[PDB]
Design a binder for this molecule. Structure first.
Ligand SMILES: [Mg+2]
Ligand SMILES: [Zn+2]
Ligand SMILES: [Zn+2]
Lengths: 1202, 468
């Protein structure tokens, strides 16, 4: 229907064209008949009838008189919904300035008329005159005259000039402006001005003037002479129970405006002193600004409830505004909500749904099927049949939901796994039954959690749920590619208990034909689950090339391991099961099954694994008791020793040998050491036992303690938890950060007294409050990240570029932080991977690195490679499939139309809550910084070189001595300037000292061309470089944190990308969170989209203009095709917020934040939104240009091009 | 330095000193002097006195209101009849000697002067005062427009020289025609339009019989008088602005803001000065307080409610509140409606009707809940919507009616359809349904009865039965 949206100033003619009449009275309704009053705020003659196809008289009342005007009323006989569309207008007695174009800094009126804002307010507030027409007089336009001064120059000239007051004077000044002549004057001054600040002033004013000239808008339209009036149904006055009425504040504001306007007309008719007219005009201006934006101009008007009235701007802006409460988020039909229980009998694609809830949700479908099969003649018969709850109604409901997927959601929805499609199974009850294996995806536990359910209606939605949203499809984490349906808690405990090993168990040493005989022996009580036996195992290997090789052989194992092998699918080695199985082992099993067998086998294997784990956890009988918290006997003696030597050191302190701070520090150190030793002793005591084998010798065996098993299996609990249960709680902190000298020496088994519990609460309250605030901080960060990268959609397949990023293993000392396989898995190479020391091509170009090629790279010991990356992609809009690589949640190459930006933002934002020289290797030494490389050629040590046993190329042996988390992420993504940034080298030249000016110091640099540049360095700066030294561009002058803008400006795009990626991955890796770096690269690409045009060329671009990058790239391509002067640019780095507010579409920017500023800018400029991104299409109800709708939008630009 | 308009308003009104008694008398004397000059200027008009005389002729015949004719008598129908008879006699004497003895003769001038003196001893109602003002204002404005059109057409010095006596005389036209300057060709061409303009002027001058100088002098005198009176009244109100704000303070927090009350009090005070009298010997504050009070109270009663309550019902509510407070103080509990009805001398039903309609509609942003995010407005239903099941039922009913009527004969189904208005814009009664083929009404009735008779057959009526 429509293809674009414009915005711009509204002329009085346009407002009159919108209006269906003029509101002349503040009347709303009659107090007796409750009917609309004529020429009022709710007039039926202006806005339409109150009843459908009726008029206020009652003479024309049926549909026969549609479209006729009641000659004695004027009410058009039509539908009442026209009262939601028909607008009115008020003819203001005096012009009123628009509040948005006056007080939203920068003031458009202010810099169009090149005079300060306070001057304009003084004129508007009726305090100072302005000369509009100077005539044959020395006065100049815009010069202010006081009242007495005004009479002086009136009596000394007369009618030769004109001086006025108020918004009328501003309108006269703005209407007489000759915009082209002003523009020419600004350009001429711009060329001939030598001050850059003045240049910024003039370029702003010239941009605004040229925007006015090109958009066709006129400046005088910023002053309102006709005020539009909203339709009554959007500002309702409706009755409540008991005769009370509910109204909107817009009614009060409009009534105030109308009353003051009518009083102004009355005062202009009955000739009044100028003071009264001036006061009335002030009131009119104040009322209009309050209606448009309450509280901006001054004190906000309050209603009868003593709270500020909320205006149109408040109704379009804010968290509770129309954009965010009703457009980007809505309440929907065919939805339900219930508490969630656990269904251990369900499959991965099934969810338990209550019968009553499904009956309510699927009511129209039941009606349709009852009508189709003939059990109901009409729809009311079906309604009563459903309400009476017959049996055939239940059969119809069974057949309706037979293959109708349903969407389950849990709030908050941090990532896309928070909503999934399941097949419903009707259960008698009131709670939704959820499969355990999906709980980790929902972050759901059964302590009172509630989930929402939604019913897709059309066939497209059902197939999207079945293909994309089905729980069986989403079993890989899109953030890292690891499985998300890994078992936890009782499944892990059962698989651990079944796979443990015991000495001298019943049936030890027996020979078994296979897993079936092991199960038979277990069921007959011949052998225990932990008996060490020999089993004949037939094992099939599927190789990388697909070869299927089966080998049968005798393996030493346990009974439980064979019974678990009974369910393992063919194609996996037995070594994956011939061990005790913790959480990591089961995760490895699932990963291997996915990598070598596929998806269906993985789902079946996971279901069988969780069945078996639950069954044998139930059969184990694992229980927690007070005797399982064994407290080592060494704890009491060690506490006694620590206390005695505390007494000794306190006595020594009384002798004055050491100070108080030293005593505090060493007491803390001894208490930390005592805690560590007590924890170690408790772990050693708890982790082992002594048994008797078949020979009678005492043997050392792993303990079967319940808490030890829980902690070691990874089901729940860690070493620290056991330490507080059975050892020492340790040192706790005073709530300002300081650590109390005395620690807690009692665990939870023995119990604490009053002060120990008080110190515990000190930290408990802080932890709770920190979680509460950090959740909101992470939510705001993820909102910003979603909005900055919402436009990124895979639009092509190959972008035809040669650029790429060079990747190496990360080294932060003498050990690796991440292997090259982890970083290179799922990417596409840019240039051919040549084998080191050889010219052969091991890996060709444009090939995806899967596990096989990763193992190849690991075998051939490649240190550095280079692959395609999103930021280096040169697609005009979005990115291409090759530059993005593998889709982590799917395992293959990313499909066209994938919203990679939203996935990236969710992946980064989801773990926000979890947030807060001796050589060691044998090899050679290389200098660049110091590098130590093994004989294979992999650089495995990177060390700093402050300004050495071995020189360059000298071999070094082992042991030779050559010699705050989430705020940090937010600051990195906002590109915040450090408080004390490191000063960098602007250009490669020789350093020299300069004149030490008072206050702060100056330095000079001499370039290769002999030009000298002066740098302004503060006094309190540690200066590193020395005079006469040629420092390269980007060298550190003063140490400190590096600003991202500086490294982008001086070093390059790859440098800033690497910096941001490394910092973000460091903060996410300290907490042990796995996030792929392509998401960060997408965010960085969205951070690099603008450019300051330096060399203007001739493509219409002012110097110093912040244009957007791909427009320049396209324009440069056309210019090259024309062989005519191209343009040169410098790329800027903008934070996610600033980049979001700087996007081309004004709808998305308005919906994000700062709606008033964005709307004012767009309206003055006359912007045009073409609806290319996700958010605008979401707001206007159209299909998003991503995923299933992508092709549809493509067809649109197939039509617009033709 | 400030953004509140109230403070700027007080700054502006505080720059003028406060007046005393003698200042009030001086300003009132200036107003009366201006009014007297305006009355004297208008009295020098041949059409003014006849209007007053005929108005008195109608009034004395007991056919018109006496108050509408005059409002008072200046003293330095017992008495009005004699004065108006004297005025009529002097008008007859003046008409006898207006032109027979000569316009420049002393008799006419003396008669006009004494007519002015007689008319100065009159206080006319402002209505016909402004009515006579407007006619001469329109005549002067039309003369100005014609003169400016002539000036624009001709464009000089010759017109200025002959403007005193030959502005509209044909001698100016004859001399222009006689002139032979190089630019007189286009002037002669425009002489046709100038002739039309002066012909239009002849009717005005014969209506006035004053040529050009006399009407100009009258207009100048009237303008001077009105300007002087306006200046005096403006000074007087600028003085009393402080009384306005002092009185308007007492009625705040009644739905209207302070500045609006101040402006309404200002309007009421201007009305007060429009009818102030200083001969009574009473100061201005006493008279002005009543008018400021009435303006403020009327504005509050008319503009302080979303749903307007008439003034009389506002008074009823206020008196009910006062009596309720008195009874509450007297017995110690809220007075029940019967007791208030007995006290207020009205039936109980009227008291209840007053009670229910004294409410002020609530806001839709009232915080409903501990968390301020929720509001009342989001818990309001839309009662005008049609339930989807009802729309589906309507569609099914249309389909079933079509199916039932399709099993009926063409003529007969047409009769039913275009009697009940099915699939057509309007409905038809028996007459136009008859006018199709058979104009007789009774056959249409009988065929419709046959329609219903076959339509209640169980073989073809089961489907429509389920819709009840
Ligand atoms: Mg919970
Ligand atoms: Zn009507
Ligand atoms: Zn690409």
């Amino acid at each position: 229907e429509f293809d674009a949206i414009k915005i711009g100033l509204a002329s009085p003619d346009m407002i009159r064209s919108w209006s269906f009449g003029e509101v002349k009275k503040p009347e709303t309704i009659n107090y007796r008949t409750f009917k609309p009053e004529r020429d009022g705020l709710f007039c039926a003659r202006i806005f339409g009838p109150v009843k459908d196809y009726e008029c206020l008289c009652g003479k024309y009342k049926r549909l026969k008189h549609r479209g006729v005007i009641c000659e004695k009323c004027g009410v058009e006989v039509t539908q009442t919904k026209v009262r939601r569309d028909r607008m009115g207008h008020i003819e203001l007695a005096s012009p009123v300035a628009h509040i948005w174009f006056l007080k939203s800094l920068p003031s458009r009126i202010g810099l169009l008329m090149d005079m300060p804002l306070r001057d304009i307010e003084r004129v508007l507030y009726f305090e100072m005159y302005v000369v509009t027409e100077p005539g044959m007089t020395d006065l100049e336009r815009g010069q202010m005259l006081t009242e007495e001064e005004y009479l002086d120059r009136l009596e000394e000239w007369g009618d030769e000039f004109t001086a006025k007051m108020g918004a009328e004077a501003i309108k006269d000044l703005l209407a007489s402006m000759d915009l082209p002549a002003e523009a020419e004057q600004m350009r001429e001054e711009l060329d001939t001005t030598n001050s850059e600040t003045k240049r910024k002033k003039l370029t702003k004013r010239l941009k605004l003037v040229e925007a006015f000239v090109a958009s066709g808008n006129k400046p005088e339209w910023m002053i309102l002479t006709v005020l539009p009036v909203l339709p009554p149904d959007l500002r309702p006055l409706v009755p409540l129970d008991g005769g009370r009425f509910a109204t909107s504040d817009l009614n009060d504001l409009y009534r105030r405006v109308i009353n003051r306007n009518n009083r102004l007309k009355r005062l202009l008719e009955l000739a009044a002193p100028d003071i009264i007219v001036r006061n009335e005009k002030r009131m009119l201006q104040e009322s209009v600004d309050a209606l448009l934006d309450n509280g901006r101009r001054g004190r906000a008007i309050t209603g009868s409830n003593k709270r500020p009235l909320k205006s149109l701007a408040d109704m379009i802006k804010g968290k509770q505004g129309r954009f965010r409460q009703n457009l980007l988020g809505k309440r929907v039909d065919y939805s339900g909500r219930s508490v969630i229980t656990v269904g251990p009998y369900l499959r991965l694609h099934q969810c338990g749904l209550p019968k009553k809830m499904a009956l309510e949700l699927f009511k129209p479908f039941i009606y349709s099927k009852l009508e189709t099969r003939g059990l109901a003649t009409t729809i009311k018969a079906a309604k009563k049949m459903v309400e009476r709850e017959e049996a055939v109604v239940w059969d119809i409901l069974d057949e309706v939901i037979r293959e109708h997927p349903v969407l389950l959601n849990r709030a908050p929805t941090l990532h896309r796994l928070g909503i999934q499609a399941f097949e419903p199974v009707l259960i008698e009850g009131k709670a939704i039954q959820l499969h355990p294996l999906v709980c980790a995806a929902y972050n759901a536990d059964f302590d009172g959690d509630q989930m929402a359910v939604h019913v897709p209606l059309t066939l497209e939605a059902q197939l999207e749920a079945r293909t994309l949203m089905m729980s069986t499809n989403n079993i890989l984490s899109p953030a890292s590619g690891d499985p998300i349906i890994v078992p936890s808690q009782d499944v892990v405990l059962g698989l651990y208990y079944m796979t443990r090993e015991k000495i001298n168990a019943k049936g030890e040493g027996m020979y078994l034909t296979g897993p079936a005989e092991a199960e038979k022996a277990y069921r007959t009580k011949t052998a225990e689950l932990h008996a060490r036996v020999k089993v004949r195992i037939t094992e099939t290997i599927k190789h990388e090339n697909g070869k299927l090789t089966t080998e049968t052989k005798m393996i030493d194992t346990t009974v439980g391991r064979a019974m678990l092998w009974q369910i393992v699918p063919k194609g996996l080695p037995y070594s994956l099961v011939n061990q005790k199985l913790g959480k990591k082992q089961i995760s490895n099993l699932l990963n291997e099954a996915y990598r070598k067998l596929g998806l269906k086998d993985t789902v079946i294997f996971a279901d069988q694994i969780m069945y078996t784990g639950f069954a044998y956890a139930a059969l184990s009988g694992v229980s927690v008791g007070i005797d399982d918290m064994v407290v080592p006997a060494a704890k009491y003696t060690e506490i006694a020793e620590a206390e005695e030597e505390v007494r000794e050191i306190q006595e020594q302190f009384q002798s004055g040998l050491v100070t108080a701070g030293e005593r505090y520090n060493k007491v803390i150190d001894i208490w930390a050491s005592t805690n560590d030793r007590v924890a170690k002793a408790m772990m050693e005591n708890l982790s082992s036992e002594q048994v008797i084998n078949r020979q009678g010798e005492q043997e050392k065996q792993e303990s079967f303690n319940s808490i030890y098993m829980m902690a070691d299996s990874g089901a729940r609990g860690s070493a620290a938890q056991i330490r507080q249960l059975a050892g020492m709680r340790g040192l706790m902190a005073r709530p300002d950060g300081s650590i109390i000298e005395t620690p807690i020496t009692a665990n939870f088994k023995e119990g604490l007294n009053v002060l120990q519990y008080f110190i515990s609460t000190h930290g408990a309250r802080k932890g709770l409050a920190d979680t509460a605030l950090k959740t909101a901080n992470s939510g705001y960060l993820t909102r910003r990240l979603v909005d900055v990268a919402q436009d990124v959609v895979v639009t092509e397949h190959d972008c035809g570029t040669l650029e790429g990023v060079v990747m190496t293993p990360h080294i932060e000392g003498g050990d690796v932080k991440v292997a090259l396989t982890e970083l290179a898995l799922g990417r596409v190479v840019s240039e051919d991977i040549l084998k080191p020391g050889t010219d052969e091509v091991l890996i060709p170009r444009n090939t995806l690195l899967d596990e096989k090629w990763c193992k190849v790279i690991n075998d051939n010991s490649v240190d550095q490679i280079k692959v395609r990356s999103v930021v280096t992609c040169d697609s005009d809009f979005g990115c291409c499939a090759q530059c993005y690589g593998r889709d982590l949640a799917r395992g293959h190459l990313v499909n066209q139309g994938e919203a990679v930006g939203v996935i990236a933002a969710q992946s980064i934002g989801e773990p926000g809550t979890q947030l807060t020289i001796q050589a060691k290797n044998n090899g050679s030494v290389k200098l660049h910084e110091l590098t130590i490389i093994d004989e294979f050629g992999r650089t495995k040590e990177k060390h700093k070189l402050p300004y050495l046993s071995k020189a360059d190329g000298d071999a070094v042996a082992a042991g030779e001595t050559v010699a705050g988390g989430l705020p940090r992420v937010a600051d990195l993504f906002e590109a915040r300037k450090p408080k004390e940034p490191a000063i960098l080298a602007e250009h490669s030249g020789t350093v020299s000292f300069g004149k030490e000016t008072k206050g702060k110091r100056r330095l000079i640099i001499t370039r290769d061309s002999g030009d000298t540049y002066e740098e302004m360095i503060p006094k309190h700066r540690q200066l590193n470089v020395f005079e006469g030294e040629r420092i390269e561009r980007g060298d550190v002058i003063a140490d400190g944190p590096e600003s991202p803008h500086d490294i982008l400006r001086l070093r390059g795009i790859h440098a800033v990308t690497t910096y941001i990626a490394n910092e973000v991955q460091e903060v996410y890796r300290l907490q042990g969170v796995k996030i792929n770096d392509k998401h960060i690269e997408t965010i960085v690409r969205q951070m690099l989209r603008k450019c300051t045009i330096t060399f203007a060329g001739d493509s219409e671009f002012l110097p110093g203009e912040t244009v957007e990058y791909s427009q320049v790239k396209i324009a440069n391509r056309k210019l090259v095709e024309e062989g005519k002067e191209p343009a040169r640019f410098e790329r800027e780095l903008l934070g996610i917020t600033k980049a979001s507010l700087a996007t081309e579409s004004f709808i998305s920017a308005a919906s994000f934040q700062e709606t008033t500023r964005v709307l004012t800018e767009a309206a003055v400029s006359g912007k045009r939104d073409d609806l290319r991104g996700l958010k605008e299409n979401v707001i206007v109800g159209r299909l998003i240009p991503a995923g299933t709708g992508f092709a549809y939008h493509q067809d649109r630009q197939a039509k617009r091009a033709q | 330095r400030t953004t509140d308009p109230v403070r700027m308003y007080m700054r502006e009104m505080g720059t003028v000193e406060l007046l005393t008694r003698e200042g009030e008398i001086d300003i009132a004397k200036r107003i009366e002097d201006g009014i007297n000059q305006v009355q004297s200027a208008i009295a020098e008009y041949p059409g003014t006195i006849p209007y007053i005389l005929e108005q008195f002729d109608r009034v004395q015949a007991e056919e018109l209101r006496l108050t509408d004719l005059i409002s008072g008598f200046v003293d330095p129908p017992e008495l009005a009849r004699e004065k108006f008879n004297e005025l009529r006699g002097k008008f007859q004497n003046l008409q006898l000697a207006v032109n027979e003895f000569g316009r420049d003769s002393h008799q006419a001038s003396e008669a006009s002067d004494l007519v002015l003196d007689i008319f100065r001893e009159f206080r006319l109602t402002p209505k016909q005062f402004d009515h006579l003002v407007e006619t001469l204002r329109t005549s002067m404005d039309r003369v100005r427009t014609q003169e400016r059109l002539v000036m624009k057409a001709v464009v000089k010095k010759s017109f200025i020289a002959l403007f005193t006596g030959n502005e509209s005389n044909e001698e100016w036209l004859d001399k222009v025609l006689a002139s032979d300057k190089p630019y007189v060709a286009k002037v002669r061409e425009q002489e046709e339009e100038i002739r039309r303009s002066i012909q239009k002027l002849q009717m005005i001058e014969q209506e006035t019989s004053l040529s050009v100088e006399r009407i100009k002098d009258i207009s100048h005198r009237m303008s001077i008088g009105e300007a002087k009176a306006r200046r005096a009244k403006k000074e007087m109100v600028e003085a009393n602005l402080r009384l306005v704000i002092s009185i308007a303070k007492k009625y705040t927090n009644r739905g209207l803001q302070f500045l609006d009350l101040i402006q309404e009090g200002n309007i009421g005070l201007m009305k007060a000065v429009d009818k102030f009298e200083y001969r009574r010997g009473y100061k201005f504050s006493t008279y002005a307080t009543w008018w400021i009070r009435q303006a403020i109270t009327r504005s509050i009663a008319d503009q302080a409610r979303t749903i307007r309550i008439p003034v009389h019902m506002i008074e009823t509510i206020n008196k009910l509140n006062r009596i309720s407070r008195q009874m509450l103080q007297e017995m110690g509990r809220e007075p029940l409606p019967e007791e208030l009805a007995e006290r207020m001398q009205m039936p109980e039903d009227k008291i209840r009707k007053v009670l229910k309609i004294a409410k002020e509609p609530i806001s839709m942003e009232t915080p409903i809940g501990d968390d301020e995010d929720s509001h009342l407005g989001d818990f309001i239903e839309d009662t005008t919507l049609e339930l989807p099941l009802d729309s589906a039922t309507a569609t099914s009913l249309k389909a079933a009616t079509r199916d039932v009527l399709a099993g009926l004969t063409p003529r007969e189904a047409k009769v039913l359809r275009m009697r009940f208005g099915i699939d057509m814009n309007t409905d038809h009664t028996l007459e136009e349904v008859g006018k199709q083929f058979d104009v007789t009404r009774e056959r249409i009735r009988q065929i419709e009865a046959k329609a219903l008779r076959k339509l209640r057959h169980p073989s073809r009526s089961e489907v429509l039965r389920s819709f009840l």
